[PDB]
Write a structure and sequence with these properties.
Its EC number is 3.4.21.4. This protein is mainly beta. It folds into two domains: 120 residues, Thrombin, subunit H, CATH 2.40.10; 103 residues, Thrombin, subunit H (Beta Barrel). Helix content is 7%, strand content 32%. The strands form two sheets. Strands 1-9-8-11-12-13-10 form a seven-stranded antiparallel beta sheet. The chain has a six-stranded antiparallel β-barrel with strand order 2-3-4-7-6-5. Bound molecules: the ligand NC(=[NH2+])c1ccc2[nH]c(-c3cc([C@@H](CC(=O)[O-])C(=O)[O-])cc(Br)c3[O-])nc2c1 and calcium ion. The site of calcium ion has 8 residues, from loops.
């Protein structure tokens, strides 16, 4: 997260860190046994880390659980990042409490201008890599479809939305991929891609979760 602030330990209780011997992507806990992340974060050997704040130090509240299976959307296109969503089933259920809790799926899509909270342990520099130890937060608004398409002509599908600041300076970045975009207490987006980080006129692009609620429910139900 570039231009964000320190969230504060466990203030984003649905945030998870996907670890394969190091932090590589974020995710969101949607129930005690399932996490939603981005399909481009797929790999084998994933350990899901819940109740984290400082990813380099065990401080208490952490729960490390191996992923039993990862289900990448069948229509995910790695070239366009269309349908960039994946569900991870945990080997055992997480113990939910105040520090570890799930986030609700939306019942409707959000409109442009809605303010949302984006969080993660991704790069904090738009020029160079500087990864933080603790969880960073950023409040960003969802942009209009016309500003989004103007910024990335021919690259935005109906399963994506832009959020951020066209003036640059504040945005999600590499390492934040797979993480949550929460608006009014509902998970509306998944950090997917962008051109660089926090560059002027190049806002972040997010997977539009409201278009996948039925798929998520159907898939969880059958697995
Ligand atoms: N501006 C954003 N909102 C944004 C969000 C997620 C991103 N994820 C990435 C991202 C970048 C890489 C680099 C590779 C590198 O330098 O290691 C690349 O261009 O392929 C790789 C991944 Br995987 C990313 O998710 N950039 C991102 C930018
Ligand atoms: Ca820790």
């Amino acid at each position: 997260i570039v231009g964000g602030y320190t969230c504060g330990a466990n203030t984003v209780p649905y945030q998870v860190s996907l670890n394969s011997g190091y932090h590589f992507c974020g995710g969101s806990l949607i129930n005690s046994q399932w996490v939603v992340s981005a399909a481009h974060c797929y790999k084998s050997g994933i350990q899901v880390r819940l109740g984290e704040d400082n990813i380099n130090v065990v401080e208490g509240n952490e729960q490390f659980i191996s992923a039993s299976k990862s289900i990448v959307h069948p229509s995910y296109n790695s070239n366009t990042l269309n349908n960039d969503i994946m569900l991870i089933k945990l080997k055992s259920a997480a113990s939910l409490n105040s520090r570890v809790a799930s986030i609700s799926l939306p019942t409707s899509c959000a409109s442009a201008g809605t303010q949302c909270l984006i969080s993660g342990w991704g790069n904090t520099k738009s020029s160079g890599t500087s990864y933080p130890d603790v969880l960073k937060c950023l409040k960003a608004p969802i942009l209009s479809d016309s500003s989004c398409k103007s910024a990335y002509p021919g690259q935005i599908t109906s399963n994506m939305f832009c959020a951020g600041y066209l003036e640059g300076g504040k945005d999600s970045c590499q390492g934040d991929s797979g993480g949550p975009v929460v608006c009014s207490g509902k998970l509306q987006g998944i950090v997917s891609w962008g051109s660089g980080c926090a560059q002027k006129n190049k806002p972040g692009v997010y997977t539009k979760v409201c278009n996948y609620v039925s798929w998520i429910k159907q898939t969880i139900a059958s697995n």
